[PDB]
């Protein structure tokens, strides 16, 4: 993966240019920012189906970026599980 420790007061232009040009990421056609996440390692089955069949599949078809927390907990963990199951 590509990681960068960056200050809180970092202008988005520099990091976006780093991602698109230096790290070789295509510019997104859509950005879905996933928020929230109820406590508990187990999500509702319909919610998991929505994350996998709905969000990740649409992101792959439209060439989108899925943006959330990168940590292995909460909604980040659930979106990662959806990505893994889709792949």
């Amino acid at each position: 993966s590509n990681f960068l420790r960056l200050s809180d007061r970092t202008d988005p232009a520099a990091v976006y240019s780093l991602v698109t040009r230096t790290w070789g990421f295509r510019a997104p056609n859509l950005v879905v920012s996933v928020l929230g996440g109820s406590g508990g390692p187990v999500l509702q089955t319909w919610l998991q189906d929505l994350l996998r069949r709905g969000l990740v599949r649409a992101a792959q078809s439209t060439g989108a970026w899925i943006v959330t927390g990168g940590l292995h907990t909460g909604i980040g963990r659930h979106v990662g599980v959806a990505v893994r199951d889709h792949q």
Partner: protein, 81 residues
Amino acid sequence: QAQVERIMTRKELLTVYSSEDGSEEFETIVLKALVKACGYLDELRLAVAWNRVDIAQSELFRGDIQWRSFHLEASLMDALL
């Protein structure tokens, strides 16, 4: 009556093949009869012992359980051997 009481004493070893269950659901029922007896084996190691990759895929895809690293490593060693 005493014999039936002794039967029900170890009631975790008894499973019922309900009339609702179809024939195509035989193996799954066997699974739910074996792992319940365990509580060593898990559904992944049983799926590897048999040649049923569909059962392994179904078990891995279900989200209610969270398979840990020692389940997966045991199943992978069984599959490699």
